[PDB]
Amino acid sequence: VVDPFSKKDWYDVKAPAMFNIRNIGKTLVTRTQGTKIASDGLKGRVFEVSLADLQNDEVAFRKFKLITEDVQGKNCLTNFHGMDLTRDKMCSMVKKWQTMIEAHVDVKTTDGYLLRLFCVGFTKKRNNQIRKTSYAQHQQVRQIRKKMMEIMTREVQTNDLKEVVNKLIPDSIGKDIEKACQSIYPLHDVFVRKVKMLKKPKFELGKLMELHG
Amino acid sequence: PLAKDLLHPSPEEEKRKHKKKRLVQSPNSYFMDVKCPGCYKITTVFSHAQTVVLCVGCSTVLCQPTGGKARLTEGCSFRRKQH
Amino acid sequence: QPIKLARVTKVLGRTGSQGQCTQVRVEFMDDTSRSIIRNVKGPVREGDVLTLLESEREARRL
Amino acid sequence: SLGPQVAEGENVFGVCHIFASFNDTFVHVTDLSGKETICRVTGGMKVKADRDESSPYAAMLAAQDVAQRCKELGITALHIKLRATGGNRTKTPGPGAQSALRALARSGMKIGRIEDVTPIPSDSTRRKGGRRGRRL
Amino acid sequence: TKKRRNNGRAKKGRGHVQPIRCTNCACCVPKDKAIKKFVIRNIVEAAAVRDISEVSVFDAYVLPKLYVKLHYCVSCAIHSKVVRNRSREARKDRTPPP
Amino acid sequence: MRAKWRKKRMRRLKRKRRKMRQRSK
RNA sequence: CGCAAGACGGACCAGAGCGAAAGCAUUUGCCAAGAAUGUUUUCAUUAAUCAAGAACGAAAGUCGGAGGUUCGAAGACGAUCAGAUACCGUCGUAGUUCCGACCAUAAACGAUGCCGACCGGCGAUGCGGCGGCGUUAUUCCCAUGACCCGCCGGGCAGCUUCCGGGAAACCAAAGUCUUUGGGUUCCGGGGGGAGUAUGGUUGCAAAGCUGAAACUUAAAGGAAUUGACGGAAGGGCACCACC
Numbered sequence: 001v002v003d004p005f006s007k008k009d010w011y012d013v014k015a016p017a018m019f020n021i022r023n024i025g026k027t028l029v030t031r032t033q034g035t036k037i038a039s040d041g042l043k044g045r046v047f048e049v050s051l052a053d054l055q056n057d058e059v060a061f062r063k064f065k066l067i068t069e070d071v072q073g074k075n076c077l078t079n080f081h082g083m084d085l086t087r088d089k090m091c092s093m094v095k096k097w098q099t100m101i102e103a104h105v106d107v108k109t110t111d112g113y114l115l116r117l118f119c120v121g122f123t124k125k126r127n128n129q130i131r132k133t134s135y136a137q138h139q140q141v142r143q144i145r146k147k148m149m150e151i152m153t154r155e156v157q158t159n160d161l162k163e164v165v166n167k168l169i170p171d172s173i174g175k176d177i178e179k180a181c182q183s184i185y186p187l188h189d190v191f192v193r194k195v196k197m198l199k200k201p202k203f204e205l206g207k208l209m210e211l212h213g
Numbered sequence: 214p215l216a217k218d219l220l221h222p223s224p225e226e227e228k229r230k231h232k233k234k235r236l237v238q239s240p241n242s243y244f245m246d247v248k249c250p251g252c253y254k255i256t257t258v259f260s261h262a263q264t265v266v267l268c269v270g271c272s273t274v275l276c277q278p279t280g281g282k283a284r285l286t287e288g289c290s291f292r293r294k295q296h
Numbered sequence: 297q298p299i300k301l302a303r304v305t306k307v308l309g310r311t312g313s314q315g316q317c318t319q320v321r322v323e324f325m326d327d328t329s330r331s332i333i334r335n336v337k338g339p340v341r342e343g344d345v346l347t348l349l350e351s352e353r354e355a356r357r358l
Numbered sequence: 359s360l361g362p363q364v365a366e367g368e369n370v371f372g373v374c375h376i377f378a379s380f381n382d383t384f385v386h387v388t389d390l391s392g393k394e395t396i397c398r399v400t401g402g403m404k405v406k407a408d409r410d411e412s413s414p415y416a417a418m419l420a421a422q423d424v425a426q427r428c429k430e431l432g433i434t435a436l437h438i439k440l441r442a443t444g445g446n447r448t449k450t451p452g453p454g455a456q457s458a459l460r461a462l463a464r465s466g467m468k469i470g471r472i473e474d475v476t477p478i479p480s481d482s483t484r485r486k487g488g489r490r491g492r493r494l
Numbered sequence: 495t496k497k498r499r500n501n502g503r504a505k506k507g508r509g510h511v512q513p514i515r516c517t518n519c520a521c522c523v524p525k526d527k528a529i530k531k532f533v534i535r536n537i538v539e540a541a542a543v544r545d546i547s548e549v550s551v552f553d554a555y556v557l558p559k560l561y562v563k564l565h566y567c568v569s570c571a572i573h574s575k576v577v578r579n580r581s582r583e584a585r586k587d588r589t590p591p592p
Numbered sequence: 593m594r595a596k597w598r599k600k601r602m603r604r605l606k607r608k609r610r611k612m613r614q615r616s617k
Numbered sequence: 618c619g620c621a622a623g624a625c626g627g628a629c630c631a632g633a634g635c636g637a638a639a640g641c642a643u644u645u646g647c648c649a650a651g652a653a654u655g656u657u658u659u660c661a662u663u664a665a666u667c668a669a670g671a672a673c674g675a676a677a678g679u680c681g682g683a684g685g686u687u688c689g690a691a692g693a694c695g696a697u698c699a700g701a702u703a704c705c706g707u708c709g710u711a712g713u714u715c716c717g718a719c720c721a722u723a724a725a726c727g728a729u730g731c732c733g734a735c736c737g738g739c740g741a742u743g744c745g746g747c748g749g750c751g752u753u754a755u756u757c758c759c760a761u762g763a764c765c766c767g768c769c770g771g772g773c774a775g776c777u778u779c780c781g782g783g784a785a786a787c788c789a790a791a792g793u794c795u796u797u798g799g800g801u802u803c804c805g806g807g808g809g810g811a812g813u814a815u816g817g818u819u820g821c822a823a824a825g826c827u828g829a830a831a832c833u834u835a836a837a838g839g840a841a842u843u844g845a846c847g848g849a850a851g852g853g854c855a856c857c858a859c860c
Contacts, residue, residue, distance in 0.1 A: 003359075005396075005431060010361035013390060025371045025390035026363065028431075042618060045391040050471055052552075060471075060555075067618095087474050091561030091628080095534075100629040104644075122629085126764040128752070133631085133742080140762080182754040186763050193681080231769060240657055241747075241769095261656050281655045282744045287759050314860035356540070367552060393618070435551050440537055440560075446687085448517065449562045460542035461548045470551050472537055474560060481626035481643085483687035484713080491521025491567060493704055495786055495840065501727080504632035507773040509725095510640050514627090526632070563628065566755075572849085579850055588632095588775095602813075603824085609814090 007031050009038050012075045013047055015066060016211040018165050020056045024049050024066070027076060039071040046081060055169055061089035062168075065197070066157075069208050077212050078167050080113075083195040090120075093189045099123040099136040101187060105150035112201035113161040117192050119148040119177060124188035136185040144181045151177050152192070162211060168195060246292040247275050247285060258283075258291070301325050302334070302346040311335060311358050314340055324348055333357055359431050369468055372396055372428065373437035374421075375475070376458055380443065381408075383417035383454030385424045385462070387436060396458040401454055417454030418461040425449035425465030435468035446485040451476065498585070502568070503527040518570035529571035531564040 009031050013024035029042045045068050052060035065082035094100055101121040108114040121144060125134045136144070155173050156164050167173050171191060178190035222236060232241055232293035247258040258266050259277050262283035275288035276283045285291055302322035311319045317335040324330045325345075335355040336346065363370050373392065377384040386398040401416035402408070404423065411415055430434070438459065442451040463469055504526035505511050514578040537560055538546060546557065571577045580587070593601075 005359055013432075026361065027389050027391055028361075028394050028396070045389075045393045046618070047390050049390075052840055062465065086558070087478070088558035088561070092559070094628050096629070096631075098629075102629095102643085109805090124763085126753080131742090131764080133633085134763090135631095135633090136763095149644095152438075180755085183752090183762060186754070229768060234769090242655090242657060244657080259657075263656070263658090279655090281745095285762070312860085316860055352544070354540070391618095446515070450517075450564075451560070456538050456542055459538065460545055461584050463542060463545040468551045469547065469549050471555070472546075472558060474537075479625085479627065481624095483624060484689085485515045486518030486522045486688070487515070488689085489522050491516055491519030491569075493519075496728095499787095500632060506632050506727095507634080508632095508640090509636085509638075512642085525630075532628095561628085575850080586776095599812095606813085607823090611725090 002167055004030070005195065007033070011038075011071065013066075013068070014075050014077050014212060015049070015054055016077075016079065016165075017213050018162060018164075018169070018211070019054045019064075021054050024054070024078070027068075040073050042076060043068050045076075047078060050086075051169065052122055058169070061086045064165075064168075065208055069203065074087070077208055079208055079211065080161060081197045083168050083192070085191060085193045089176070090193060093120070093122055097121075097132050098125065098134050099141060099185070099187075101136065101141050101144050101148070102193075103145045103152070105149045105152045106198070107153050107156040108199075109164060110158075110160045111207075112199065113197070114199040115156060116196040117152045117156065117173070118194035118196070119152060120150065120189070120191055120193040121177065121181065121187035122189040126184045128185065136187075140185045143184045144187065147180050147184070148177050151180060168192065244294040245292065246287055248292075249273060249275055249286070250288045255292075257294075258285075260293075298349050300348050300351045302332075304336075304340055304342050304344055304346065305331065306342060307340055308333060309358070311355075319358065320346075322348070324351070337344050361432060369435040370433050371437055372433040373439055373468060373470075374424065374462065375439050375441065376455060377441040378412075378417065378452030378455035378458065379453050380412055380448065381459055382388075382411045383420065383452055385417065385421045385458050387424055387428050387433065390437070391453050396420060396431055396433060398433045399423045399427075412452055412454055414454050417458035421458040421461030422465055425467050426461040429466065435470050436462060437470035438472040439475040440472065441474070442476040445479060446482045449476050449478065455490030502550065514565045516567035516570050517564050518574060519567050521567040521569070523565070523567045525565075527568075529566040529574065529577055531566070533562055533564060535560045535562070 005028075005029055008028040011027045011029060013027055015022055015024055024047055027042070027045060029038050030036075031036050047066045049064050049066055050060055051058050051062040051064065054064060063084050063086060064080070065084070066078035067081040068076040069079040070077050081091070099122070101123070103119040105117050106114070107117060123134050123136050152173060155167050155176070171178075174191040178187065181187055219236070226234055227239075231238060242260045245258055245260055246255045246267070248255045249268055249272060251268055252270070254269060256266065256269060256275060258280050262276045263278045264276070265274055265278065267274055274286065275289050276285060299300055302324050304320050305323045306321055308319045308321055311317055312335070317352055318340040320336045320340055321331055322334050322336075332351075332353075333355045334346070334348070334353070361370070372387045373390065375384070375386045375388065375392070377386070383401040384398065385400070387396040388394065389396070399420045400411075401413065401420055402411035404419035405411065405413065425460040439452055440455055440459070442449050453469055459469075459472075500506075503524060508526075511524045511526050513524050514528055516523055516528070528591070536557060538545065538557060539575070543557060547555075566574070566576055568577075572579075
C-alpha cells in the first residue's frame with residue numbers, strides 16, 4: 001500500500017587513493033528503521049568497477065571488486081576485495097593453435113591480506129613463423145608455470161595490500177612474467193587474469209583512513 | 214629412375230642415408246682430441262660420449278652428456294681423429 | 297521527427313516474399329553524400345524522389 | 359525518489375541485469391552494487407500469453423516500463439550485464455536481449471559498459487535430456 | 495557400403511574421445527565427431543549499434559563481442575542447415591566455404 | 593523384429609525354460 | 618553477499634600425443650614403468666607365431682561399505698493422440714560417484730590377425746638425433762630455448778597416379794595371386810531353424826564359454842546402375858501459381 005523507495009538515503013562510494021577517479025557512483029539504502037541500521041546493511045556491498053572508470057586514461061578490460069569497509073556519514077569508504085578481466089577480453093585471448101598456460105598462488109601480503117592471484121599466458125606465433133601450431137612441450141609449460149608462481153609470490157609477500165593494487169593497475173606483474181619466460185617459450189598475452197581476496201585481517205578504521213589519502 | 218648407380222652412389226647420397234641403410238654399414242660417430250685449459254695435454258673422448266669425462270689427475274669435468282653428440286665445457290676445444 | 301526527402305540513384309534489385317519491395321540505395325537532399333539502402337513498394341526507377349517519414353531505419357542487404 | 363545528487367550533467371548510474379532466456383526476458387535495474395534493486399519488469403509481466411513472453415516486443419515493453427520507472431528515481435545512465443540461460447544450458451542469449459537493450463537506448467537512458475555474465479561453467483554437472491538427446 | 499574414409503569423425507590413433515552434449519539437442523556426440531562453430535558475434539546486430547553509440551556515457555567505446563563455441567550433433571547441424579549433403583566428389587573437399 | 597529385441601525375447605524365454613526345469617528336478 | 622555438499626575438469630583441444638587393448642585432459646608432489654631416438658656399450662640366436670593355461674578388459678548389471686550435487690532405467694502425473702502404459706514436459710527409484718570384491722560382454726570397428734621382405738610421388742605433422750644464412754630472449758657473451766632451411770629414424774595421418782589389385786565401392790595396402798608356396802595363429806562353407814535344444818563348464822544372479830538335429834527354403838546377400846519415391850538439400854518455370 002506504500003512506496004519502499006520513499007525511505008532510501010543516497011550515499012556516495014569512495015575509491016582508495018591508489019586510484020585516480022575518486023567518485024564511483026551512488027548507492028540507495030533504506031534509513032535506520034528501529035533495529036536494522038542504514039550503515040548495517042551497507043557495510044558489505046561489492047562494486048565491480050572498470051579500471052577506465054577508476055584510473056583516468058588506461059585499459060577498459062580490467063575490473064576491481066571494492067567493498068564498503070566503513071560508512072562514516074554520506075560517504076561509503078571502500079577497500080580492495082578482488083580483480084578480474086572482462087570475459088569479452090578473456091574469451092578474445094583463449095584461441096586455437098597456441099598453448100594457454102595458467103598458474104595460481106595462495107599468497108599472503110605483509111599485513112594479513114591472504115590473496116589468490118591467477119596468471120594466464122598464450123604462446124606467441126613468431127614474426128617469420130610458417131608452422132601453424134606454436135605449442136609448448138609439457139616441460140616448457142611447467143617452467144613458465146613455475147616462473148609465473150615464483151614472480152607472483154615475490155611482488156605480494158614482500159610489500160603490503162596498497163602496493164600490490166598499484167602493481168595490478170598497470171601489467172607490472174604480467175610484464176615481469178612475460179619478460180622472464182621469453183627464454184623458455186615466447187608467450188605474449190600474459191596477464192594476472194584474476195585476484196581473489198580470501199582472508200582479510202581484523203578491521204582497523206585508522207588503517208583504511210590512510211588508504212583514503 | 215629405372216637406371217641408378219646402386220653400385221657407386223655419391224658421397225652426398227651416402228651421408229643422406231641411415232648408418233644401417235648405407236651400401237656398407239658405416240658409423241656417424243668419431244673419436245675427438247679434447248683438451249682443457251686446466252691441464253696442457255689431450256684426452257681422447259667419444260663424440261656420442263654419454264659419461265661425464267673427468268680430466269687427468271681430476272682437474273675438472275670436460276664433457277656433459279646429452280641426447281646424441283655430447284657438449285664440451287666452454288674453453289675445451291676438440292680435434293676429430295682420422296681413422 | 298522530420299519528414300525528409302530522398303532520391304533514387306540506383307535500384308539494387310527486387311526483394312520481399314513475392315518480390316513485392318524494390319531494394320533502393322536512396323540519396324538525401326539536405327547532404328548530397330549521406331545515402332542509405334531502403335526497401336520501396338510500387339514501381340521505382342532512377343531519378344524519382346522518395347518521402348521518408350524517418351531517416352533512421354535501413355534495409356538489410358540481401 | 360529525492361536524492362541530493364547534482365542535477366545538470368554528472369550522471370547517476372545503475373546496472374540493468376538483462377537476463378534473456380529463450381522463454382522469458384528479464385530487464386532488472388539495480389544500483390552500482392546489485393544489492394539494492396530499483397526496477398524489474400519481465401516479458402511475461404507485459405504480454406499475457408506464454409509463447410510471446412520471450413518475443414523481442416514483450417522485452418521492449420519491459421525496458422520502456424523499466425526506463426520510465428528509473429527516470430522517476432533519477433538514475434540517469436545504466437551499466438549493462440547481458441545473461442543467457444547459461445550453466446549446462448544454452449550460452450547464446452535469448453531473442454529478447456537486443457530489442458530490450460535498444461528499448462532503453464531509445465527511451466532516454468545513457469549506456470555505460472556492456473558485458474556478458476552468462477554463467478559459463480568451467481566444468482559442468484550432467485545436462486537435462488538423454489544420452490540420445492531431445493528427440494523431435 | 496563405407497561412405498567416408500574417416501567414418502565421419504577425426505579419431506585415428508585414439509580408440510576413445512570424450513562425448514560432448516549437442517547445444518540444440520543434448521545428444522552425447524564424440525568431440526571429434528561433433529560439427530563445431532566458434533561464432534564471434536556483436537551483442538547488437540545492425541539495428542541497435544546506431545542507437546547505442548548515440549546514447550553512450552563514453553566516447554570511443556567499441557561495443558564488445560560475444561564468444562560462444564557451438565557443438566552440434568549431425569541431426570541438429572543438418573536440420574539447422576549448418577552442414578549439408580554434398581556430391582560424392584564434393585564430400586572430400588575439406589576447405590571451409592568462404 | 594530388431595535383431596537386439598529378437599535376442600531379448602530368447603533371453604526371457606530361455607529364462608522361463610530354466611524356471612520350468614528347476615520345478616521338475 | 619556468504620556458507621555447505623557431491624559431481625565434472627569447458628574454452629585451449631588438433632584427423633595431435635600416449636597405452637596391449639579397454640581407455641587417458643585442473644595444480645603440484647611421490648612411486649615404479651614405457652616407446653622412440655642416440656650409441657665404435659654388452660650377451661651372441663636368446664627369435665617369430667602360438668592348442669592348453671594366464672593378465673587386463675568400456676558401459677550396463679550383481680555383492681558388501683561410504684556417499685547421493687546433477688542427470689535419470691523403473692514408477693507417478695501433465696500433454697500429444699483414435700489409443701500414446703512412446704517421442705515432449707514436470708517429478709523421481711535403482712543407477713550415475715568413491716572403496717573393496719564379482720561379471721568378461723560391445724558396431725570391444727580400421728567391421729581389416731601378428732612377424733618379415735619388397736614395390737611410386739608430394740606437402741605436412743609428433744618425437745628424438747644431425748647439420749645449416751639470419752631474427753629474437755636470458756643481453757654481456759658462450760651454451761641453450763623460440764622461429765627459419767633441410768637430412769635421418771620410428772609414429773598418427775593426408776593428398777596424388779594406369780605400381781598393381783579388386784565384383785565393384787575402393788585399396789601403397791585390401792599390392793607383389795592360375796606367371797598360384799616368406800613364417801604362423803584364429804576362423805568361413807546357400808538362407809533359415811539357431812547361437813536355439815541338449816550335455817559339460819564358469820558365475821551370487823544376470824548370464825559367459827562350448828554347441829546340435831529334425832525340419833524348412835530357391836534364394837538370402839554384396840557392390841554398383843537406371844528410374845520412381847522422400848514429411849532430404851538446392852536451382853528454376855508458370856495469372857490453368859502467387860504478388
